Amino acid sequence: MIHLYDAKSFAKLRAAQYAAFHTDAPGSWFDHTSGVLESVEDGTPVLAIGVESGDAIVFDKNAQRIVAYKEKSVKAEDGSVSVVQVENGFMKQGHRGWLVDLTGELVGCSPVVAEFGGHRYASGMVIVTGKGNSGKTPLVHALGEALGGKDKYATVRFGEPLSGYNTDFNVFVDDIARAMLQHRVIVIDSLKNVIISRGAFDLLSDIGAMAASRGCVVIASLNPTSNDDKIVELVKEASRSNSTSLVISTDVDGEWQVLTRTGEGLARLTHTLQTSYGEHSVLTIHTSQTVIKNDELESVLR
Amino acid sequence: MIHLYDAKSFAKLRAAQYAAFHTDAPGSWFDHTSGVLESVEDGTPVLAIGVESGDAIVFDKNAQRIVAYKEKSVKAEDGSVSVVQVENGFMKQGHRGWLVDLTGELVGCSPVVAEFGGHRYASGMVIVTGKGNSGKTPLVHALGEALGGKDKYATVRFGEPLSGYNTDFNVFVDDIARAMLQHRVIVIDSLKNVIISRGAFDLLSDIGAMAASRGCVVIASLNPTSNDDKIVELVKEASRSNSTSLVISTDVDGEWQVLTRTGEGLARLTHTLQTSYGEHSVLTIHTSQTVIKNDELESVLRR
Amino acid sequence: MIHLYDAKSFAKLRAAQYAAFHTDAPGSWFDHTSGVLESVEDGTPVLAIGVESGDAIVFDKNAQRIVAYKEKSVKAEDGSVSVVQVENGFMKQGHRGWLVDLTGELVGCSPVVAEFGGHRYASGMVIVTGKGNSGKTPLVHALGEALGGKDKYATVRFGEPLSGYNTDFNVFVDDIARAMLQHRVIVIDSLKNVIISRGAFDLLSDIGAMAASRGCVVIASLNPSNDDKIVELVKEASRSNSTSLVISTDVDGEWQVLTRTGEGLARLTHTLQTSYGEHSVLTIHTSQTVIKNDELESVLRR
Amino acid sequence: MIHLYDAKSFAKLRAAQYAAFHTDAPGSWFDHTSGVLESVEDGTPVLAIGVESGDAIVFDKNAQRIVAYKEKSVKAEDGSVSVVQVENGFMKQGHRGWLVDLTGELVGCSPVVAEFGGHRYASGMVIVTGKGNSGKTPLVHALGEALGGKDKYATVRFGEPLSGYNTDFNVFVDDIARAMLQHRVIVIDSLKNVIISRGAFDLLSDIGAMAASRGCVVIASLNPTSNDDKIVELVKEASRSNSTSLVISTDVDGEWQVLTRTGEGLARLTHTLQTSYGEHSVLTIHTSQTVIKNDELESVLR
Amino acid sequence: MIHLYDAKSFAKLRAAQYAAFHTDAPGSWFDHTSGVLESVEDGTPVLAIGVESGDAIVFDKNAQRIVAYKEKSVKAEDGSVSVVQVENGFMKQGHRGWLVDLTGELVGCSPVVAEFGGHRYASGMVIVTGKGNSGKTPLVHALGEALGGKDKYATVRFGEPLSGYNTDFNVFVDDIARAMLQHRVIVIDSLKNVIISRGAFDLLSDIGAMAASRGCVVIASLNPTSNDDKIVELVKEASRSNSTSLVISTDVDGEWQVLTRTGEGLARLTHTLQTSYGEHSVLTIHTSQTVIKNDELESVLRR
Amino acid sequence: MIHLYDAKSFAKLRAAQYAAFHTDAPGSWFDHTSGVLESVEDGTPVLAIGVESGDAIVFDKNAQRIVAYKEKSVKAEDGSVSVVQVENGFMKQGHRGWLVDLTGELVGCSPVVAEFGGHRYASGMVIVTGKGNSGKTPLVHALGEALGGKDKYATVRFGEPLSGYNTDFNVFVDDIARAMLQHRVIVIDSLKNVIISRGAFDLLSDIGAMAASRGCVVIASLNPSNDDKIVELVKEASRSNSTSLVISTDVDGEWQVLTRTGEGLARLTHTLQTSYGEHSVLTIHTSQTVIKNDELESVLRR
Ligand SMILES: Nc1ncnc2c1ncn2[C@@H]1O[C@H](COP(=O)(O)CP(=O)(O)OP(=O)(O)O)[C@@H](O)[C@H]1O
Ligand SMILES: Nc1ncnc2c1ncn2[C@@H]1O[C@H](COP(=O)(O)CP(=O)(O)OP(=O)(O)O)[C@@H](O)[C@H]1O
Ligand SMILES: Nc1ncnc2c1ncn2[C@@H]1O[C@H](COP(=O)(O)CP(=O)(O)OP(=O)(O)O)[C@@H](O)[C@H]1O
Ligand SMILES: Nc1ncnc2c1ncn2[C@@H]1O[C@H](COP(=O)(O)CP(=O)(O)OP(=O)(O)O)[C@@H](O)[C@H]1O
Ligand SMILES: Nc1ncnc2c1ncn2[C@@H]1O[C@H](COP(=O)(O)CP(=O)(O)OP(=O)(O)O)[C@@H](O)[C@H]1O
Ligand SMILES: Nc1ncnc2c1ncn2[C@@H]1O[C@H](COP(=O)(O)CP(=O)(O)OP(=O)(O)O)[C@@H](O)[C@H]1O
């Protein structure tokens, strides 16, 4: 819905947005939204996500896909009406994203998902990428472990010529839906095959906001291997604007720069990570706030 | 409809167009068109806007979407007939835009929406853009507040990987329709995701005229930072010709140039704004008439 | 239909074409075709024009749109049959353009629409364009007034972010149809939004011939963007879709008018001076040379 | 159909092909094929041509369009079966082109259509084109007159912003069909608007063979005005390979080079024309065999 | 179907493939496959080829097109099932190409179609092409005559602005189907108009294998004289990989180089031809074994 | 399905992935998955693969295509539901790939398919490619023989102008399905014709994972044309759609083998020598080092 503001209520929102990342307890937003999801009546649609064609499939609070749901209308606070109808497995009426209000008056946040090694990490989508020798798959799994902390992290596998990997996009979004409904920390290997169908475009534009509204983090690897002007700019756009955070490799092997958006038109934060390998190529991130401007960001985006 | 003119009636129109921006009371056009909207019979379609596919959804005066409306014909002054029919939520007959006459004989106006810091601002669409370090989201909200004045301004959120943001285009146009039906000052964050489907193209071409006819201002942020020849020229065209005003960043951080179209084939006006940040990144525009030619405009249009 | 010629009847046509522009009374062709239109039986289709999709809508002599019309066949002089049928608002059978013969044996003309300041102006489409500081919207309205003379000129508004402007292409062609059925002098602001759907392409290719056959003039502004696809389409429309061309020059206020006088005839050029009065109203100052194709192509660069 | 050959019967064909251009009486082939057309039973389809969509409309021997025709099968000499069926104005079964055998065993010819000023001219399509100041519309009409000789030549008008011009492609092909069924010499002004829909592509590939099989000549003007690599190469291909002859302007104003294909894999012939203008821009070709190689042809094709 | 191999049975195949070109009697494969075709039951589909749309039309052993054929299933040796069904003139089930096994265990062959002037020529598709002054149409007819020897060669005409030429693609493939069902030596003039619809793409990819499996040769002219990067690379690909042999003109007028694939991953053979013209432009090839590497091939492929 | 991990269970997986390539008995994974396939109930769908259109055909354990199969739902361990339905030969519900779990908890492996000449070879897809004089078809057959060892290898033929070759894509995928259901070592000649329809794109993205999950190896030849669109698609398929890469070098007869050993594991390189015998039969001469991404990208240029 839309929101009305004056000087006073806008200052309150900016202060609440600041708190969502800087002062709130790591993972609290996730716990809150779980409660919201739990309070929903049984079989009521909570989430819809786009399939390859651009149609959308719909899920309830138990990550069960809904085949049939009679049309129902909900009048929101602003006066706008939300209609939802599902027929033969697909959304007849409604929109893509959260079909129930997870956020209320609190929007444009970057809720804090976890803290690790003296740094706070944002929910939403984190894109792991860059050129050079530093490996992306070992990094996503190490971050997934670290930010999961006490909790296990979920791995969604997609589009690699290795054993057990799904290559069907429609199963991919079904995995992603379920992961976001049930887990705070999610890893995606890999995002290469989506980078084009309507579903693939829908996902790039939908997932960061879906994740941020849930308070979960989706950590996807994206190898920018191609030299093609069409596809390489789509990697830059997804890295710059479709993602909530960006983890990118550097000149020095093992080293990475993390770029975090802290909220709606707020300062973007940067820090550096050191890493090293153990047995069977398991990566560990070494444990032991500065802002970045847009000219620094565009320089890094190469 | 079409309008017939001679030397005498054309001079009258140019003089009335001048008044709409230069002399009329800020926000008066908006108040007028509200009255017009209020006088419409209940459930009668007043506005239609295009969805992703290029179909269109339709609304009444209370920003309520219309599912069913029997075909009805209205004979305008020029002799042209307007037909409107809605079936299963979508427009079967009719056009995109205002389905009732908000403007009458007064066309090509650029109605003054507000005054702030010694400068008058136009209704229609304002595109906020440019390259460099100066931030666009803090600027749209500051302008939204300033031009709202005594009134609150409405925020439509779209296509950012942050909490509570809608990313479905069909909900976006539903938010925009409602905002324009009910508020003088509107902010859009952000216009990146529309910049391509028929709906997205329809919106770029429809919104400025919709806004200007209502006497409300839509203030949209558009980051041009990507470097593809296809998409960058579409940002220039939208900035040059789809927008009623243009707010663009400069070399000096915090500083912006405002370029305003004052009316149908009238002089384009430029002025400069200074800004600074307060607590939690809230931007304030500092408080305390010159024309710009097309070669100056094209020079500025490079970013 | 098709026309058969020998040396003698071809010389007659060239002489009649010469007269249509050079010697006939300004506006006489328009008056003639009005009479033709008036003589048509009531509700009989006279004009069809293409909508966004490439379908076409149809009108009668009173600029009223026709929803239903039973199939009817007309055998022309050459033996060719013209069939017209309208169903549910759209043309089922027939063609785009004038559905009744306005021209007879007299074709490839550039009928003279008006005279002003010692120069004759052609009916058909006039494209107003060029780069630099000289303004196009003030010029189309000044020309519209001047060529209207004793008569008012009709303004069709399209695709500008200003109050009261239509942005729906289907209403645009409905305005244009009506203007051409009822007025000698027509202004279009602006042609930028058509410059792509089938309707938009149909209009660029249809309007000059529609106008020239009626003996009315359509004066459209077209601001010429730096994309190779779109810029060449502006050159083609300026070179070959238009009957006349009005283009700005180095000196502010000054314009060159390039007029096609008929089917494979000499193209004529002259110069205009202009200045502004109050509320930005433009006046054209009151007080025959041919142009070759190498001069034309030189001028066509902007 | 297909044709079987040995050394002896192939030499006979080459000798008969030589005769079709070099020794046969000008216009004889046209007279022959008229007789063939006349001998066909009434209402039997003789010609089908493609409309904008790629569907095709069909005609009988009197250039009357056929709405309905029951499926009929004809067993040719080679054993191949030709099926023709027309329903609701369009071809349900059959092919584009001549639906009856005009040529028999005699194929790959360039039948001589006329003789004028000491030179023989081929039937098929003649494309008139080139850059520079020499005008194309005056030239097509002068050639149309000259090659028509005792007979009038037919003019098909298409896609110019002048009075009486059709701009609907479906009417254009209906005019062309009729012209070819009833006249030896045909002029087309202009071919710019086809140069893209399936019909337009079909026409470029169909018309030369249709014309050559009838023994009529279609003389089309094509202004190569565009500077676009996509469209300019399509003008070169149409000029090189879709046309039977090529008339192209030169450096010297008034002067043209005619390039004629004399038959299936035969020598291409070149000659030069002088021209000048009279009253109301009527062009006269001045009255008072050499082969061209492929490297000379490609040089000229610029 | 698929084929299983070990070292021993693979060596046998390579030796049999060698024989198909090098030692077998010229035209013997064609005679064999005729016998196979003759043994088929009446009206049973033997060949399907793609039309402009990508649908396919089907023929029997007498080159008669089939309108109706009830679904029938055939279990091959490998266990795979071939289903064929024709309805309303078009293939409802089945594939493009030979609908009956012409080849059995002997695959990847390159069967010898004829011998002329001390050189053996392969069945399959021969593309005649190149730039310069040497003419392609006189060459295809001369080769057609020479390789036909005692037998007449069939000419399929397509897409030239000359008398009696078909320009409809659907008739073209009907001519080609019939020619391949009934003749060892076939000429196509010209392949320019296919060089894009699904049928045209299907044909480029289907014809060489169809011809090679029959043991007939299709000799097509392809003028590459146009200069567009999209279309010129498609001429190179068709010349390099869609054709079984390649005949290409050289610097010296009248002279041509023939490049022959002798079999599945075997050595490619090159030789040179001299030619001259007689009466009414009839070309004669003058009468009285070396391998070419891929770098030599790619060098030659530039035109 | 998705998999949950902590530090401990992730280390176990990496150790199991290491074993799948490095320590497990060559071909053991293939033998296991055969057993799995054998245990399936008769006529139950086990594999679906995409046809030219993007629809998919489905097979059972005996490589017999399924025309009809009533909708059936299977609840997996993670809670996700797999639905399969086949109607009129095509998949109505379900996904592309293995329709039964071949891999369980063990995913992202590169199961060892064979050992030959002191080196271990991975299942999945091996792309054989490169520029220069070294021949690809003789190499795929030599590798097919060598890795087959005691077992015969299956050859799928596609898109060459030679006798007995299929050129229909729908038969190609039917051959591939069957080969993978029944054989450990598979050769494909050739992959040029797929390199574009939805099926062709689906296959490039599906085959490596299908093969790796089965524990069979598909060895395809791909000759790399000088078009920027198509050449980058060859690089992407070589870099990321394939499990291993065999590429020719400067020295004739010599090849470099690049092997992915598992999910985000070290890529291994070794060199092969070859020579020809009689009738062009190639023999690979009988008698671990890692490669970095900058070395890989250097090699990827051809
Ligand atoms: N023990 C070890 N020591 C150093 N580097 C290692 C390692 N194990 C794995 N890596 C690194 O991890 C990389 C593999 O991860 P990525 O960079 O994501 C490419 P990928 O995922 O294997 O395939 P892709 O290119 O298709 O995505 C290897 O190239 C290697 O540099
Ligand atoms: N306290 C502060 N001081 C200086 N600049 C600030 C600030 N708070 C916010 N900003 C500026 O606000 C900008 C954020 O808005 P923008 O960059 O214009 C659009 P966005 O929110 O980054 O979406 P995008 O990344 O998809 O473009 C930053 O570039 C930053 O420079
Ligand atoms: N009084 C005045 N003095 C000088 N120039 C004037 C003027 N009034 C108007 N103009 C010129 O006329 C121009 C307006 O017409 P145009 O620019 O050609 C159409 P536009 O308003 O830019 O809409 P567009 O987006 O379709 O181009 C202005 O740029 C201005 O320079
Ligand atoms: N009396 C005369 N003397 C010399 N040249 C003349 C002439 N009358 C006509 N022409 C020539 O004929 C030309 C017109 O024919 P074309 O070259 O075919 C262009 P067009 O047909 O007028 O428009 P197009 O460019 O849309 O096809 C003029 O440009 C002029 O050069
Ligand atoms: N008597 C003769 N002497 C020399 N060359 C001859 C000849 N007769 C014919 N030719 C050659 O045969 C060629 C004609 O065939 P090609 O050019 O290869 C295909 P085409 O018939 O021209 O169709 P295209 O123009 O669509 O390519 C001419 O280029 C010409 O050089
Ligand atoms: N006895 C031999 N000695 C040397 N080289 C041989 C040979 N036998 C075969 N070759 C080489 O192997 C190559 C054949 O395999 P490739 O070229 O890689 C596939 P192709 O036959 O060109 O079909 P393609 O069109 O799919 O590329 C020949 O170019 C040849 O150089």
Residue numbers in the entry:
A (entry chain A), D (entry chain A): 1 to 195, 207 to 299, 313 to 326
B (entry chain B), E (entry chain B): 1 to 195, 207 to 299, 313 to 327
C (entry chain C), F (entry chain C): 1 to 195, 207 to 235, 237 to 299, 313 to 327
What wording appears in the published article?
The lipid-enveloped bacteriophages of the Cystoviridae family infect Gram-negative bacteria, mainly plant-pathogenic Pseudomonas species and share similarities with the members of the Reoviridae family, including bluetongue virus and rotavirus. Their genome of ∼14 kb consists of three dsRNA segments small (S), medium (M) and large (L), which are sequentially encapsidated as ssRNA precursors into the icosahedrally symmetric procapsid by the packaging NTPase P4 (15–23). P4 is a protein of ∼35 kDa, which can assemble into a hexameric ring. NTP-binding sites are located on the external perimeter of the ring at the interfaces between adjacent subunits, whereas the nucleic acid binding sites are found in the central channel. P4 proteins are the only known RNA-specific helicases belonging to helicase Superfamily 4 (SF4).
To understand this catalytic mechanism in detail, we performed side-directed mutagenesis of the residues in ɸ12 P4 involved in binding the nucleotide ring and analysed the mutants structurally and biochemically. In ɸ12 P4 (31), as in RepA, the nucleotide base is sandwiched between Y288 from the catalytic subunit and Q278 from the neighbouring subunit. However, the mutation Q278A had only a moderate effect on ATPase activity and virtually no effect on the structure of the bound ATP analogue AMPcPP when compared with the wild-type, primarily increasing the KM as a result of reduced nucleotide affinity. Hence, the stacking interactions primarily determine nucleotide affinity but not specificity.
